[PDB]
Amino acid sequence: MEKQNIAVILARQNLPLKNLRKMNGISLLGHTINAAISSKCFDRIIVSTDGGLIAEEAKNFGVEVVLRPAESSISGVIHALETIGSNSGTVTLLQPTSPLRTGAHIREAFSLFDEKIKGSVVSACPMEHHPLKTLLQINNGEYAPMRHLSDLEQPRQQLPQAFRPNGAIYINDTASLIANNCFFIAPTKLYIMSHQDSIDIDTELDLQQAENI
Amino acid sequence: MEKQNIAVILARQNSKGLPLKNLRKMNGISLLGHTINAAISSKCFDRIIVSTDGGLIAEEAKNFGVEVVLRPAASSISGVIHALETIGSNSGTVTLLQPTSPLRTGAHIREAFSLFDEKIKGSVVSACPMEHHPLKTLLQINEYAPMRHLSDLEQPRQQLPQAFRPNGAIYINDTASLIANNCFFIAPTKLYIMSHQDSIDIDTELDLQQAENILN
């Protein structure tokens, strides 16, 4: 079992036919497949779907397809890895819903992965509102500061830089992903992307916004 | 001295960013006016003070029949403290009401007030739900660390506590406490939940049109 760098693009059929909606003539799926290919980072690029329309689009792009029976992201990735029978090397989840995430973004993200430490590399963007400046509802009558009550009045500039995964990229050691059964594996490093490039396609406005960009 | 319920509206005239924002009209009434109206209608205050450094803001304030304190040409706390000292009140309650939250009404204030406890005297702060969950984040610790658990990063919305953030519209506090603590967030801070629309904060032209559109 020689190590292989695998890319997994989960793309379901059922936005109607969201993954096939086109942006400048290329489907959302095709855009992500193109980033994977151009990134030159993968030995194998697999598209896991549940519909021939997606599978057909995947094959047209010269990539492998893993069809899924009847029916969770980690389950899709685990399945895809078992289907191709890979349990060693790296595995990257690239969701079609991040059209602005390019081959270049992938290379930069991958260049941060540490083969020896094996922590996750997750693309993320800056948080408009700082997460320490929030409170959690215990119940209808109690809300606890995220951390210290004093933080709510601290300048964000004076607070730890905070980021949120944007969903475009999740790079992991394959053995560690299979073992922990999750995409975030300590020590996690983040690949920072602009909010513009982190656009998550969900509605029509999104498809309009991303294209314009 | 006798306890007093004070509303302090901090409104500078030369607004950094959107110029003369407080005097900026939103559907006929100035932004300052909307907040003063909320303060008036609330029927919760004994005194309503607009703190400012502009004669035009002061003029608008007086036209709505409220008090004015002129400030010299952690800065919010100092402004409220200055207003309190100016009217000579160090007892009762003090509420900061920013004119940048034109959709926070008198009813919102009234509702916010019913949560304040006179014994424990903790703060009452209006807040709105957070779009991106604060537990699904990481902070640079120079490495990156999860807000709480890495597992949290992979949790669906409704499997995490609901999160909220102060929206800036209301901050209610016991007066002696605010003065002793020199801050707005005090012990047993309770939140008064408001919707996103009602929480809109006016900082840009777009916000302005957005706030108007919402009222229309």
Side-chain angles (χ1 to χ4, degrees), chain A residues 195-203 205-207 210:
Chain A
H195 294 213
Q196 191 176 80
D197 285 337
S198 311
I199 196 297
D200 210 282
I201 308 301
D202 273 305
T203 64
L205 191 164
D206 298 347
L207 287 157

Side-chain angles (χ1 to χ4, degrees), chain A residues 33-48:
Chain A
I33 286 166
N34 281 161
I37 292 163
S38 59
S39 79
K40 304 194 297 291
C41 292
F42 317 100
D43 299 305
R44 315 275 297 275
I45 297 169
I46 282 66
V47 171
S48 170

Side-chain angles (χ1 to χ4, degrees), chain A residues 109-115 117-182:
Chain A
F110 224 100
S111 71
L112 300 179
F113 183 70
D114 181 316
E115 194 179 11
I117 305 177
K118 303 177 193 309
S120 303
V121 167
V122 177
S123 53
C125 56
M127 285 277 292
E128 161 183 50
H129 299 116
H130 204 290
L132 288 190
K133 297 174 101 173
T134 64
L135 307 80
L136 297 190
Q137 170 181 293
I138 301 301
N139 61 70
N140 44 283
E142 196 193 313
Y143 308 83
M146 180 46 88
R147 184 178 69 172
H148 308 312
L149 187 64
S150 49
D151 297 313
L152 289 291
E153 285 181 276
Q154 280 303 344
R156 76 194 312 295
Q157 39 141 57
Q158 271 167 46
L159 299 174
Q161 295 277 302
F163 304 89
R164 74 165 182 91
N166 60 19
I169 307 173
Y170 299 78
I171 300 162
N172 280 293
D173 165 71
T174 302
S176 306
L177 173 300
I178 295 177
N180 304 206
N181 202 227
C182 83

Side-chain angles (χ1 to χ4, degrees), chain A residues 87-104:
Chain A
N87 64 15
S88 177
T90 66
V91 58
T92 296
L93 172 65
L94 300 163
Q95 308 182 69
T97 46
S98 295
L100 291 195
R101 179 260 292 110
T102 70

Side-chain angles (χ1 to χ4, degrees), chain B residues 186-196 198-205 207-212:
Chain B
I186 306 172
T189 287
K190 181 58 178 63
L191 302 182
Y192 169 66
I193 311 300
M194 291 178 63
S195 76
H196 264 127
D198 290 355
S199 286
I200 181 178
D201 189 315
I202 310 298
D203 262 19
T204 90
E205 204 71 40
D207 299 346
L208 210 296
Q209 160 151 61
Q210 187 156 289
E212 289 189 353

Side-chain angles (χ1 to χ4, degrees), chain B residues 80-167:
Chain B
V80 172
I81 296 306
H82 175 244
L84 293 176
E85 305 191 312
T86 305
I87 62 194
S89 181
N90 76 347
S91 170
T93 74
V94 61
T95 301
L96 162 57
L97 294 168
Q98 293 181 150
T100 39
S101 300
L103 278 160
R104 169 258 295 107
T105 71
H108 291 313
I109 293 178
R110 226 181 285 110
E111 272 181 37
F113 257 92
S114 69
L115 296 161
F116 183 72
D117 160 35
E118 272 104 3
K119 183 67 193 310
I120 298 179
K121 314 171 189 174
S123 314
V124 168
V125 180
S126 49
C128 54
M130 279 283 278
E131 181 178 297
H132 303 305
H133 205 292
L135 286 181
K136 303 166 85 177
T137 64
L138 287 86
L139 319 186
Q140 181 186 297
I141 73 178
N142 46 285
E143 309 84 351
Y144 286 100
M147 184 46 84
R148 193 175 63 179
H149 308 127
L150 274 186
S151 61
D152 297 333
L153 289 164
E154 280 176 281
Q155 290 288 178
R157 246 225 206 304
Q158 289 215 67
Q159 268 309 294
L160 293 171
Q162 287 179 78
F164 305 87
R165 57 170 185 88
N167 62 188

